[PDB]
Ligand binder design. Structure first.
Ligand SMILES: Cc1ncc(C[n+]2csc(CCOP(=O)(O)OP(=O)(O)O)c2C)c(N)n1
Ligand SMILES: Cc1ncc(C[n+]2csc(CCOP(=O)(O)OP(=O)(O)O)c2C)c(N)n1
Ligand SMILES: Cc1ncc(C[n+]2csc(CCOP(=O)(O)OP(=O)(O)O)c2C)c(N)n1
Ligand SMILES: [Mn+2]
Ligand SMILES: [Mn+2]
Ligand SMILES: [Mn+2]
Ligand code: NA
Ligand code: NA
Ligand code: NA
Lengths: 579, 577, 579
């Protein structure tokens, strides 16, 4: 008897391959037997095996995040699928295309207390934009058309704007092993069963009129740019700002701070200097153009929120609604490059004055220049790491930035610079979970060196993710910023309420992470100065190697030091202004 | 200028305490500040701080599994809550009561791209029997009544049969820090705002007629008994099987293989000998009574499923539907003790024939007796562990058993004995996830020694759960069964196909676990013999102390040796006959 | 002191008006007080009061279908909202924008057995693309920004492609009456709080290459056009068929059969003649281009489904996936006009051969000519009503076509003609529910005459929808095709199993509908010939006026007369073809 799984799943897997899927992250199980095996057999899909399904999730995340096209993510029936939940959520908010396949029992064994079986229908709720429970396998030509169409449709839904996770629950009946000598991947058509052509979203010159006029009329504007992934969008946003002569508050994930592009318009110190009331009044713009999601900067958020008379224009091609201020005045569902090209074409020919832009460049330059006069030697002040690391991230490598303080410190401390490198971070939901695995995935995805900057609780959180270093031979340099607990919470007003603060917020572990390096076969460094940090820090991607570089820092004293440093620089700016 | 959070959340947490909540498992975060601070400040609730929310969830699972009453599980907004999903699923199917509180942002900050904010409504779907999005804090008498009522209700729901997880999403608005010096816990009533009294379920004399008739008139019955947690139900199920003279196929989770109760009726080798067609025909029963969920034994499942003419009577007080054979003939939603007694009170004085019982005892005695003559010295054969460890587990302690082969090996090799101890396992959904933390929770829950028997892939899966040892000073003995990979898959007929087997199923980590022991401050042992295993093995609960005992075994040769051993004790049974 | 509801809900309703809402369909209730009163008081919103929520829902459906922009749909707490489900489902599949607002009890009165309170959270599941449970009313400036933003957002989501229903559940605390003397609609800005600019989707020249290339090369192509709304799209689809010389199988809902456009390419008898295997064999195309949802024609479906080697190109601007054949070869997520212009731009100037097209025009013309010769005098044969009615539908009016046989008969017997009028049908889910109220709403919507052709079970189903005639003074001409039961089931192979058929499928009512006309103050006709019909039939929209025109037909003999009549025409075609 032919087993219907051979050609049904064969066709399913083959069609994903035809769709451009080149990678599959697979977690072991018996029930998922045919999905796994057939991904392995298929010559166009590379299989990455991961034991911990939570890490597996964030690994696929990182992979897909790197290439901006989907990867398969496969597990067996039971709590295995439930473990994907954190990564699916992050993928949903970050708009990362993932195709989740979960094996399931057939109907006669569901909802009746069979071993390892759970309700997998709509498991991920609305975090996935497409869900289906595939038909029990069948061999008819009509059902093979159905299964290939399902695969294409799933891949198509993942890549369709609001890119995100999709979910196919795959019930499978016993005899699970596909017959690999019976052309399981056999096709009827020459190429793709169905090719899916998704498109760009545009808003025309005319409906854009209100916005063009307010931009034509406002000398005082600023562009706020969060996470960016498109080169074209970056070139065009930069061009747009020169045409308007508006400064760009550039979030680190925007990657406008680091590159050979023109940066005269780029402002990198705003998170610090905008905490001052007086500089805010001075730099208050009449109009704001936002690109991408909200920047990391809390002071930019508070600024737009607490001053709603500032007219915000929000550009989001995907047509979502990302504006926690409730104060934005225009929500524009337009490709960033189309939007910028249209505005530029509508402006008059006269080069605008750069006076307004100069105020910003003045405040920014004077801020950074004063910071330079303040010592960065002390490795135990957490801030200094970033003041040093910015200059050392090798050209064309990736920097994966942990949540909690590291993404805030990168924002605070990274100045604009001429060397290309990519900053990545899990900013859809800001989890400290699966960060190691995301960085691992990014590495698989880019095939270039990756540095991961990460706090100790986060590191601990995804210790399991280090398995990929050896098991998959994935090179990674981890900069572990270890202040033994949750350093971010020291910034809360409630940090003085000391009877509970340490138990419930500081939460130290006391862990010696050199044992984690050994566990996962990585090398270990614990530099006591930047000279020896520089000697230790050498990311690479030519061969396997896990390098843990641990920096011990003092969370109990960092807040006052941090604030004195910045306040002192802000104070200097105000003095220069008065000259 | 009062913060409404002070008394609103104060009243919320205080009421949980009034309901009998004594433990809160708490994961750090900003938005959950009042939840965590108030649990900490309240004199009746012990706080257990966990960093890894996935671990935290299984830690709470184990705590509530040990006590059969709800604990609080708390986290802040975002992917934190999503990390509770695996434990919530297991609690759902194991029927473990847990009250999940997830901090959220307020409305003006939801669904709008705010930092760390996710859609938390109905987060766990129907794995939870009760969900609500609680009101934004307000301090009026009416809303304080509402909030106290919600806590009790949440508590009551988790304990209402099918016990299980419940979820309250708690949106909170800045000023987050409650004012501790302003009587946050103040009430209007002397005790509980609302006391919830749930009850036992009963089916009456009449409705049990057809069933009590068939049992009376059937000589050839067996009782299948999986996981049980009731002392009364255990006694009565035994009483019952004496009155009828039916054998009891005791799943390890029934715990009927290890206690002071009478065990003449208890059968423990069935999973092994029922693999033979001939012994099955000899011992084919007319009627089967089931208590608890499905036993671990696949052969018992396949028996009832492939011989549908065997009449099954399934007893389930919770009214669930656990029977993947699709062939049971009576589903009875009645308390196990009430059912047993009603069946017994309707039996005549006609002292029952025990030949049928004796056929079972014969087969069990002969199986065990022959196996005993087989050498157990080789530490590298996985089965031997359980053959030795059975006699070593301290009295009044707990053995937590990992999924995959360990629960199966416990089934195969644990014989009935008089030494009392409890066996636990995550058999709701058989995950290899969070097993270490569940054992950790059981230890906290019982304040008695705990031994965890776990395979290597599962141990790696919840390495992070070991943090509880130093951070919470919970003692634990871990017997790490390391065969470097997924040993269970070797039993599959598809293990023969070699090109992919190892990659996709074997999946070795090659991890050296001594480094893990160092990481979490545990003492390490790697005994080459049962003598040094004995010296190393010393579970205790008086002080902190993590002990990792690694047994290296060979999965490549394990199956063939396992089958020989067993097929030989079966052959020997068929001859003694 | 002040009631929060006054400015909270006031700001909510005012912002909907600022969004473009001009109509609110409202159902009475106590808990929905502020919603209904404030809509009533607002100068830009017309309130339409419907008692039966199910009718209300379909009425809102027709109103929004007519104008292609959203309306408010409002009811109190409880089963009232559950009665919107059928309309919401139809709006979802038909892609009709509706903003559904449901009043609710406050938290302290929910899930605790309070009178009339049900769980309204996610009431409509995923039939709505946006749902929220709004905050309890508050008066703070931040919450008035939140609620105005919510109104904009709800409106924006209903109009955002795949247009459809959205749901806001509105919990309200008692004292419910807003203070109308305290400027409930007061703004913080001049004009819209946020303006939402949706755009259009385009695929660029380059990713259209393969499809353009195959279309330039395929002589034998066909365009299949289902429900259309855009005038630009019609013009461009027609232009494209001439550039390519492809016939357009024009579904009645394309409205390509009844307008001033060039119809030289329009094929109208395909549903009939494509039932024949030999004509199918002769007219088989290599490529198919689909616009709009699937047509009504079952024969076209089965054709495309059973010959998967016919290469289909489906254009769907909204990004959905409408193809029940599982056989399509390309899904293009692109504006139809844009797609059309791109293909035309890539075509050479060379004369396109018209022989292929002439085969189709020949078949169609011969079919229709032979049908001309078959008499239509018999008012008891249902087909005839449509052969007569097509020339009688007043120019610039609407024909709303009931589901079941009417839509099929319209497809069968409406030929192309130069007279303009619009045909509407609820083809989203094909329900026989709410058709009257839909019609009523199309009349409110177009401010022009509406004719409704509907079968008797359907007409019975929404008898309540006729209240809108008296109560709301809406004129409607109802052509009631009464065959006493489910006429359509006679085409089933199972109409022979007489032992259960009449009981389960025929389902006669015996109802004398003149009582219904009387109940609702309508005038009644029962024409015995087409002459009496031509005399009674006079759709208008200047005054109130409900006209019920009943046609009694015989479903027992219909099928054979129908099939004989069409097969006769088909056979004439083949004869003619041989000459
Ligand atoms: C999965 C998850 N759980 C909890 C949180 C709440 N949270 C935000 S920051 C933080 C502490 C992070 O500590 P660490 O990684 O050491 O960085 P640090 O604060 O020391 O810079 C926590 C627990 C979260 N963001 N994600
Ligand atoms: C969370 C989860 N992922 C995957 C599975 C599928 N599964 C069942 S047993 C097993 C292998 C476990 O290996 P180990 O703990 O070493 O036990 P062994 O098979 O060697 O006895 C797997 C992957 C599961 N049950 N749960
Ligand atoms: C709400 C609903 N219920 C049932 C159906 C199934 N259905 C399709 S046609 C039909 C019969 C309708 O009869 P009628 O309106 O008299 O038109 P006729 O069939 O006589 O052409 C039914 C019940 C449906 N489409 N919608
Ligand atoms: Mn830290
Ligand atoms: Mn193992
Ligand atoms: Mn009818
Ligand atoms: Na492969
Ligand atoms: Na406490
Ligand atoms: Na009005």
């Amino acid at each position: 008897t032919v087993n219907p799984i051979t050609h049904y799943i064969g066709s399913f897997i083959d069609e994903f391959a035809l769709s451009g899927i080149t990678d599959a992250v697979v977690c072991p199980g018996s029930r998922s037997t045919p999905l796994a095996v057939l991904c392995a057999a298929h010559p166009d899909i590379s299989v990455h095996v991961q034991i911990d399904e939570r890490s597996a999730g964030f690994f696929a995340l990182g992979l897909a995040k790197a290439k901006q096209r989907p990867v398969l993510l496969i597990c067996t029936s039971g709590t295995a699928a439930a473990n994907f939940y954190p990564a699916v959520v992050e993928a949903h908010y970050s708009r990362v295309p993932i195709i989740v396949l979960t094996a399931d029992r057939p109907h006669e064994l569901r909802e009746v207390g069979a071993p390892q079986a759970i309700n997998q229908h709509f498991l991920f709720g609305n975090f996935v934009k497409f869900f289906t429970d595939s038909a029990l396998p069948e061999e008819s030509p009509q059902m093979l058309r159905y299964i290939r169409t399902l695969a294409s449709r799933a891949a198509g839904e993942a890549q369709k704007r609001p890119m995100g996770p999709v979910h196919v629950n795959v019930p499978l009946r016993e005899p699970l092993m596909p017959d690999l000598s019976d052309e399981p991947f056999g096709r009827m058509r020459t190429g793709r069963h169905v090719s899916v052509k998704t498109g760009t979203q545009s808003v025309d010159r005319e409906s854009l009129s209100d916005v063009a006029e307010m931009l034509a009329e406002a000398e005082k504007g600023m562009i706020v740019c969060g996470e960016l992934h498109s080169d074209a969008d970056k070139e065009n946003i930069i061009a747009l700002s020169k045409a308007l002569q508006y400064p760009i508050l550039a979030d680190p994930l925007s990657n406008l701070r680091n590159g050979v592009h023109d940066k005269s318009t780029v402002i990198d110190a705003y998170d610090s200097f905008l905490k001052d009331d007086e500089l805010k009044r001075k730099l208050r713009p009449d109009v704001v153009i936002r690109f991408g999601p909200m920047p990391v900067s809390k002071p930019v958020f508070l600024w737009l929120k607490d001053d709603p008379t500032i007219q915000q224009i929000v550009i989001d091609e995907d047509g979502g609604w990302r504006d926690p201020t409730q104060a934005s005045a225009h929500m524009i569902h337009c490709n960033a490059s189309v939007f910028a090209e249209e505005i530029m074409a509508g402006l008059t020919a006269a080069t605008r004055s750069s006076e307004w832009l100069e105020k910003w460049q003045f405040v920014n330059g004077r801020f950074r220049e004063h910071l330079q006069t303040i010592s960065s030697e002390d490795v135990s002040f957490e801030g200094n790491l970033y003041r040093i690391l910015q200059h050392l991230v090798p050209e064309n490598s990736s920097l994966f930035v942990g949540n909690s303080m590291p993404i805030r410190d990168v924002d605070t401390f990274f100045e604009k610079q001429d060397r290309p490198f990519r900053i990545y971070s899990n900013r859809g939901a800001n989890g400290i979970d699966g960060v190691v695995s995301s960085a691992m995935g990014v590495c698989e995805g880019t095939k270039a060196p990756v540095t991961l900057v990460i706090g100790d609780l986060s590191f601990y959180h995804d210790l399991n993710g280090l398995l990929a270093a050896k098991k998959l031979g994935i090179p990674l340099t981890v900069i572990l910023v270890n202040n033994d607990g949750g350093g971010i919470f020291s910034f809360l007003p409630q940090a003085s309420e000391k009877t509970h603060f340490e138990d419930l917020f500081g939460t130290p572990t006391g862990l010696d992470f050199k044992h984690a390096a050994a566990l996962y076969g990585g090398t270990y460094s614990c530099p006591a100065s930047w000279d020896e940090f520089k000697t230790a820090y050498a990311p690479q991607a030519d061969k396997p190697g896990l390098h843990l570089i641990e920096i011990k820092t003092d969370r109990q004293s960092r807040v006052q030091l941090h604030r004195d440093m910045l306040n002192e620089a802000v104070r200097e700016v105000k003095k220069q202004w008065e000259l």
